[PDB]
């Protein structure tokens, strides 16, 4: 069950609007958090994300994610954020600058190269340099809003980079 | 085993109008072997957005399109099951979401939706057959008449006849 979430390591979420519902429980592992979220039982809301507090072994279930108005991502070394993929927009607006989904495959079907790897291709698109852009794992991204939309470096040493095939939100009626 | 992560349409395969589009096929044992390969995208010269398992010919058919892509049509067959990769089924709403085909099946306050084909807990005349094109399948949140509220379902709570589901607008600035 865990993947169906995008994991952000060392991250939690804080609600500003205190009318947004929340539920917590001390649990054993993050997997048990995911299962409760996925099946959505005993939660008076739609579970869109949860955080696992690894220190207190606490599970925090939310009817929002990091793209919801009124919630701040924050660093915290004992937290992992998990976001339900159904609520991360899986289609691109324009050039796809704001694309944060988990597609990690190019249009000709090649598995993307992790941004934190210089094999087979070396590059100056570091996760560190480029904040807010979510150059995490091997996801298709478009950090500079360039023509063909979200892309990646390719695990194939003979294709430096290729765009992925993420649909426009305007593709289907 | 990733098969449970796809949206399943029973008794259905997909046909190419456009002869240009590409397909990969392979003889296998079970439907989850189609799923695993689609999810991993290994050996596919394209992005796998759907697959068909042919239960009579014991074949996977992997596709770089789904039932929504232009130049493709559904075809009936008792032997076929269609599995659509949720990453390529728009998970946000345009307008009132008359066209929404995602798989969210819980209401705003966390109630599991009642199946459209069911009259339990609630009786209604939103029969799938009366509402064609509107994909009133399983217990998914739908807005078959295009009303102000966005997608909704009859609720599995006898106390709550129906409720809106909480599905994000693709774009609202």
Author numbering:
A (entry chain A): 38 to 210
B (entry chain B): 37 to 209
Give the text the authors published on this PDB structure.
The growth/motility factor hepatocyte growth factor/scatter factor (HGF/SF) and its receptor, the tyrosine kinase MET, constitute a signalling system essential for embryogenesis and for tissue/organ regeneration in post-natal life. Two truncated forms of HGF/SF are produced by alternative splicing of the primary transcript: NK1 encodes the N domain and the first K domain (K1),16 while NK2 encodes the N, K1 and K2 domains. (c) The lysine-binding pocket of the kringle domain of NK1 is formed by a glycine loop at the top of pocket (E183 and G186), an aromatic “base” (W188) and sides (F162 and Y198), as well as a positively charged anchor at the bottom of the pocket (R197).
The piperazine moiety of HEPES makes strong carbon and donor π-interactions with W188 and Y198, and weak polar interactions with E183, whereas the hydroxyl group engages the glycine loop in weak polar interactions. A HEPES molecule is bound in the pocket and shown with its carbon atoms in dark gray and its sulphur atom in yellow. This is demonstrated, for example, by HEPES (KD = 2.4 mM) which, compared to (H)EPPS (KD = 7.0 mM) and PIPES (KD = 26.6 mM), forms stronger π-interactions to W188 an Y198, weak polar interactions to E183 and further contacts with the glycine loop.
